[PDB]
Symmetry: C3
Subunit: 173 residues, 3 copies
């Protein structure tokens, strides 16, 4: 596997976590219960700590990094889509980060936000809870409905389930 | 290698296929004759089936996935560029998907289309044959010329050839 | 590791280089002193040669490729950010390529340029030294200040240092 200890800092991974063999986890990284990191994703905890909250998933090729003074915190029940890039930011509980979305240092995404695929959130930007954030540079286009939020959570919960399926039914050929 | 069987579903790969050691193939995936999947690419067939048509290539870091009710079908002679992301869509024969392009569920790209680098095709969008599709959200900017189409195909055919070269002349150091 | 010889062409890597185990280096590739290639990055030297200048870094998931007649040359002291894609272009000394930025064939980036995250530089575009290049298609928005340039270099130099730390303190778990 690609789980690495850097210096004296070794990842803290809950047993229930699914970490794909090609998912790189380095240094100061905390992966909470029911979280999952997929193929090709990389979580490099060499500067500030990086936390992936319980029930949260980090999909294929997503890259999580930080810079000094910019810890990366992903709250519980969050989906980080394929190829996304989170850099030293804060993601609120229940949010969904779209495919290839880019979020830079100091950015703060509130609870239940949906960041659109291909969006780019610049450094220091803050967004209120339940916001649909689209564009590059991204901005709040409107508030999400109960349905939007419920579908986002359904996807995230589905991944928390898929996690167990991959842990017990995935066999190399 | 990173070829995985998920549950009872194992990938169907034609012997002529080139699958890079770091290319992840999981579950319900069909890779037809002369297709090729490069380093870091991931094809996750855990929901709907994913088919890569004969003579088609999936370049470095591209990620192919689907959601229930949204199978991913890549027709023959198609090029999927580096870092692209295809999610539950349909790609017509002879097309070219640009670098980092993103195509979401239910999108349908006709035959001989060229999707520009960095474009974003939203869910459900459909585009006619021979279209040059650019933007995010992407749209048809104009019809491609015989030359445009011929150059696209030349690239794809070149990859079908490069496939054999890598299968027999690539040696780990 | 993922260092590959293609045909008769084998990578030329300076001993001081840090090459992550999952970093793919193939064929005609030259990695100069103090350069570093991170997890999931791929440098495919199967067409034209690809050179990574001394003290330059190629971050997670970045993909470097070329096409015939389009060599890829990355000058010394350059930072290529996470998930960037450089295709047959020329990057001037002291520059910084932002996260997920895409630069296509024949593009020329002068010395000390900063390409913004998510930008897309089309084929053949040329940009003068000390330019802040943003957008897709990207363009020069303004000249960088001494500070901007100095901070860019600080990041790149920091990576040249981090390189040694990973070479001696990174241990698989
Ligand atoms: Zn970083
Ligand atoms: Zn998906
Ligand atoms: Zn290429």
């Amino acid at each position: 596997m690609t789980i690495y200890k850097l210096g004296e800092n070794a990842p803290s991974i809950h047993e229930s976590v699914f970490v794909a063999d090609s998912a790189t986890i380095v240094g100061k990284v905390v992966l909470e219960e029911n979280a999952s990191v997929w193929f090709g994703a990389t979580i490099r905890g060499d500067n500030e700590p990086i936390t992936v909250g319980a029930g949260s998933n980090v999909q294929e090729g997503a890259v999580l990094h930080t810079d000094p003074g910019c810890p990366l915190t992903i709250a519980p029940n969050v989906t980080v889509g394929h190829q996304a890039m989170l850099h030293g930011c804060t993601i609120g509980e229940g949010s969904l980060i779209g495919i290839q979305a880019v979020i830079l240092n100091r950015a703060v995404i509130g609870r239940n936000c949906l960041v659109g695929a291909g969006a780019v959130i610049t450094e220091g930007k803050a967004f209120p809870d339940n916001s649909l954030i689209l564009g590059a540079p991204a901005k709040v286009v409107r508030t999400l409905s109960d349905e939007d939020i419920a579908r986002m959570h359904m996807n995230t919960k589905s991944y928390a389930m898929r996690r167990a399926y991959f842990k017990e039914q995935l066999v190399r050929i």
